[PDB]
Enzyme design. Structure first.
Site, short mmCIF file in Angstrom:
data_model
loop_
_atom_site.label_atom_id
_atom_site.label_comp_id
_atom_site.label_asym_id
_atom_site.label_seq_id
_atom_site.Cartn_x
_atom_site.Cartn_y
_atom_site.Cartn_z
N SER A 29 17.33 22.59 1.71
CA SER A 29 16.86 23.67 2.57
C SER A 29 17.69 24.94 2.54
O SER A 29 17.24 25.97 3.04
CB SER A 29 16.80 23.18 4.02
N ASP A 40 7.73 24.22 -16.04
CA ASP A 40 8.80 25.00 -15.43
C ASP A 40 8.33 26.45 -15.25
O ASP A 40 7.20 26.69 -14.83
CB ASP A 40 10.05 24.95 -16.32
N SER A 41 9.20 27.40 -15.59
CA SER A 41 8.90 28.82 -15.42
C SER A 41 7.83 29.35 -16.36
O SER A 41 7.58 28.78 -17.42
CB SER A 41 10.18 29.63 -15.60
N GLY A 62 18.37 27.13 0.25
CA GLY A 62 18.11 28.08 -0.81
C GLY A 62 17.69 29.40 -0.19
O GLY A 62 17.63 29.52 1.03
CA LIG Z 1 16.71 28.22 2.92
CA LIG Z 2 11.92 27.69 -13.11
#
Ligand SMILES: [Ca+2]
Ligand SMILES: [Ca+2]
Length: 321
Positions: free
Chosen positions: A105, A231-232, A107
């Site tokens: 949490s 992914d990205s 981030g």
């Molecule tokens: Ca956060």
């Molecule tokens: Ca990514």
């Protein structure tokens, strides 16, 4: 530029190709620049207005700046926040860095100059539960970000939109098992999102307000396969979507309708090397794609690879005039 190239031939030229991954037009990427002989979790490719390449590594938080021409590598600063995963440059030159924190949490998103000055908490880390993996700016300066939380059967993740003034956060789509990649179509009416732990591609048709989903507008045009998952991603000027496949040593390419039309392999994948392909990005004004990967799993290094995509890269927010 005699690099492996993707062309609009065969089923890659169809609007709705019926094809399997093994049959996709496929090329193998060429080594472009070794970032280090030590294993670094490379991620967050993004070019500034001057065409210089910025990226980072998740576990150490190093911020790198590469000169595409000379190949010179600089390490301007280091993230003061844990596990940064993406860098998106603002029209005003600031680097916006998405980070995962403790993966549970803590981030968020901070901004700073390319030298690491004027650290700003765009999305404060402890007050909200987000663990942010990536983002994409719209033409107004607002942005959509991916909440990288949960796992297969625990869809804690999702996508949220931050207003241009950065004062409000609006949920766009939730119940996603680790939202990872995100990208806006050229007209910004379609939002692409990758769901890593469930191996799914999301296509979301937005209303003009950019926050409301059109009726029955969020769909699953593609189910990925293989460990670990998508992914990205980034798009090109023809609205094709390039998706780095984490743990698969490859990048899959889709047309504007979400159908697969290309496949880019990373050297050594069959032997278990360089499987951590995490992000694709074009050199501004060209169709030359750069893809970062690393060989941490095999005790190897961190490498950037390259190939030529179907079209020139899209002029994202950092290039706006
Ligand atoms: Ca956060
Ligand atoms: Ca990514």
């Amino acid at each position: 530029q005699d690099l492996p190239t993707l062309f609009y031939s065969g089923k890659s030229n169809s609007a709705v190709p019926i094809i399997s991954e093994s049959e996709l037009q496929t090329i193998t990427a060429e080594p472009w620049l070794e970032i280090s002989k030590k294993g670094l979790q490379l991620e967050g490719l993004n070019f500034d207005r001057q065409g210089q390449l910025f990226l980072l590594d998740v576990f150490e938080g190093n911020i790198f700046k590469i000169n595409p021409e000379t190949k010179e590598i600089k390490r301007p600063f280091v993230s003061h926040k844990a596990n940064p995963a993406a860098i998106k440059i603002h029209k005003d030159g600031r680097l916006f860095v998405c980070y995962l924190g403790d993966f549970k949490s803590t981030g968020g998103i901070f901004a700073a100059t390319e030298n690491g000055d004027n650290l700003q908490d765009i999305i404060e880390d402890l007050s909200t539960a987000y663990c942010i993996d990536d983002m994409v700016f719209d033409s107004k300066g607002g942005f959509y970000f991916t909440d990288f939380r949960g796992y297969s059967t625990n869809p804690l993740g999702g996508v949220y939109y931050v207003s241009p003034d950065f004062r409000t956060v609006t949920p766009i789509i939730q119940n996603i098992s680790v939202a990872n990649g995100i990208a806006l179509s050229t007209d910004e009416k379609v939002l692409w999102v990758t769901e890593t732990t469930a191996n799914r591609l999301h296509r979301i048709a937005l209303e003009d307000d950019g926050v409301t989903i059109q009726p029955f507008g969020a769909t699953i045009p593609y189910y990925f396969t293989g460990h670990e998952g998508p992914d990205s991603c980034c798009i090109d000027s023809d609205d094709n979507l390039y998706v780095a496949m984490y743990g698969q040593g490859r990048v899959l390419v889709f047309n504007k309708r979400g159908y697969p039309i290309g496949q880019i392999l990373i050297p050594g994948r069959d032997e278990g090397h360089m499987l951590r392909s995490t992000h694709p990005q074009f050199i501004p004004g060209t169709n030359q794609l750069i893809i970062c990967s690393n060989d941490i799993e095999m005790g190897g290094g961190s490498m950037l690879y390259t190939v030529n995509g179907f079209a020139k890269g899209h002029q994202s927010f950092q290039f706006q005039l």
